[PDB]
Amino acid sequence: SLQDPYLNTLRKERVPVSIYLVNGIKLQGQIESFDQFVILLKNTVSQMVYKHAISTVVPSRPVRLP
Amino acid sequence: GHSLQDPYLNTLRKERVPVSIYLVNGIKLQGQIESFDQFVILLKNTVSQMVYKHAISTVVPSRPVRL
Amino acid sequence: GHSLQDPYLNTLRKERVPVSIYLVNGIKLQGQIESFDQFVILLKNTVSQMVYKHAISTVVPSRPVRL
Amino acid sequence: HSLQDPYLNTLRKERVPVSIYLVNGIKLQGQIESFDQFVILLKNTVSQMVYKHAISTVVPSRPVRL
Amino acid sequence: GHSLQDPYLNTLRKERVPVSIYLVNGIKLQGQIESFDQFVILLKNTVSQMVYKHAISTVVPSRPVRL
Amino acid sequence: SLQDPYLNTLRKERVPVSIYLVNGIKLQGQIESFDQFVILLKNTVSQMVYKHAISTVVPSRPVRLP
User: Fold this and answer.
1) Do the Cβ atoms of F23 and D52 come within 8 Å?
2) CA-CA distance, E61 to B19, in Å (whole number)?
3) How is this protein organized at the quaternary level (chains A, F)?
4) Cross-strand partners of A58
5) Three-state DSSP state, F54
6) Rounded distance, CA B58 to CA E59, Å?
7) Residue D49 in contact with residue B2, Cβ under 8 Å?
8) How far apart are CA F39 and CA F31, in angstroms?
């Protein structure tokens, strides 16, 4: 449950986010779309990020919560 | 099943106990548990963050808890 | 729940778009996506290698693509 | 769980001191207070909830009779 | 589903093509595939070793193959 | 299906094995027992190794295969 409304709010409002991968790498951009397994992260070009490789999704400003 | 995980996280959420969450990569997160589901935890401070359970090694409350 | 993953990989495949695949350990693989299923991706170049999805962190096209 | 459960339960019942090695090399020490399918509650200086997916090996300080 | 993984590993096993298997920790194994199931691959050489799929990042054949 | 008879052979024949973990650590010993999720690796003190943390199991000698 929770993931969906939270990611959807980030998508809809085009909130800049930081995504930390399980290996410590930080990606930055905005959530273009997502499904059950992946997130499409936009910047220069989009990239498909697998959820299994993500540790934390951190928005740049406070957002409405589920 | 989740017979220990849920009441433990729920108690920490209800009582607003500050926690430390250690990730598998050694990074330490701090805050209060806002809510959780079977896959993620929403950790609160000025901005919340969504933490995937699969990346968590351990949850350490700042003070004692009891089921 | 592959409503995004499938069409996206399928588009990279059909258009033979050069991609970079980054593994969890930091290795960058380069090539084009020849095929894929629920668990693996067959990546072409000198030889075709089979990459397990569970090892992949990000897939990055060398040029923007349209869904 | 034909091996995992009675092994963890015996450690718990007999209060055996254990070392838990995490996949990232970190060693936790303590007493097994409780566990379910996914986590172990590790007691001492303060309790902590350890996710099994992060554990590589459980090493008791003395052998246990199953 | 397994509609790419199984035929690919089976082709490798049947043709006895030597492969390199890279693990997520960066170690490289080499051998021929003797058999496999949903979870493990039996990798042959001096002795046969059992490799869990979850620890594998890529399988690289020594020469290219027909699917 | 392949895992079980293979593990069973190593056990009942008491073949010494090296077990490599996903972090590169090597464990040595004999397989006392196992279930769907863990392997009990016997020696000095037994230790319960989680399957999710194992990369490869290597017998010290060739064994009959399934």
Assistant:
1) no
2) 48
3) Homohexamer.
4) A18
5) strand
6) 33
7) no
8) 7
Chain D residues whose beta carbon lies within 8 Å of the beta carbon of residue B58 = 22, 28, 48-51, 54
Using a CB–CB cutoff of 8 Å, tell me whether A46 touches chain C. yes
Residue ranges of alpha helices (H) inside chain D are 4-13
Degrees to nearest 5, angle at CA E54 with E51 and E57: 85
> Pairing mode, if any, of strands C56-61 and F38-42?
unpaired
Domains of chain C with bracketed CATH? 1-67 (2.30.30.100)
Does any CB of chain B come closer than 8 Å to the CB of residue D2? no
Q: Which residue has the tokens 């070793």?
A: E49
Strands (DSSP E) found in E1-67: 19-23, 28-36, 40-44, 49-52, 56-61
Q: How far apart are the first and last CA of chain C?
A: 17
Q: Chains near C, with 3+ CB pairs < 8 A?
A: A, E
C42: contact with E, CB 8 A cutoff? yes
Tokens (6 digits) for C40: 């693996």
Containing B9, the helix (H) or strand (E) segment is helix B5-14
Q: Tell me the three state secondary structure of residue C31.
A: strand
